[PDB]
């Protein structure tokens with residue numbers, strides 16, 4: 001079975017590309033990471049940094065999570081990311097997404113031993 005840490009990697013890690021993300025990126029990636037299986041997942045962010053760099057965020061700036069929990073951490077440096085946002089004309093099973101590349105600080109929730117990211121909270 002898939003751990004929460006593995007699910008975070010599946011949903012949010014894309015170290016293989018720098019940012020290059022074509023206009024096609026989200027359409028392809030949302031499908032290939034299985035985020036369009038039961039529905040069109042409305043919003044999702046991929047991080048283009050090393051797993052080590054993202055894991056390191058769990059010992060960086062402690063900040064409040066959007067849900068009010070206290071286990072969120074904001075990266076000290078900006079990171080290359082791609083936001084995927086479902087288009088208005090997207091209809092399941094043919095999920096369509098607008099691909100937006102950016103460089104922003106990420107905020108992730110961390111849990112467990114070892115203490116690793118389990119949720120992507122926000123980018124600022």
Ligand SMILES: O=c1[nH]c(=O)n(Cc2cn([C@@H]3O[C@@H](CO)[C@H](O)[C@H]3O)nn2)cc1F
Pocket residue numbers: 007011043044045046118119120121122123
């Ligand atoms: O800028 C964002 N980018 C973004 O990807 N999200 C959603 C998200 C949360 N999660 C966490 O992991 C999922 C594992 O099931 C949960 O829905 C959530 O805790 N995954 N995607 C929210 C943002 F504001």
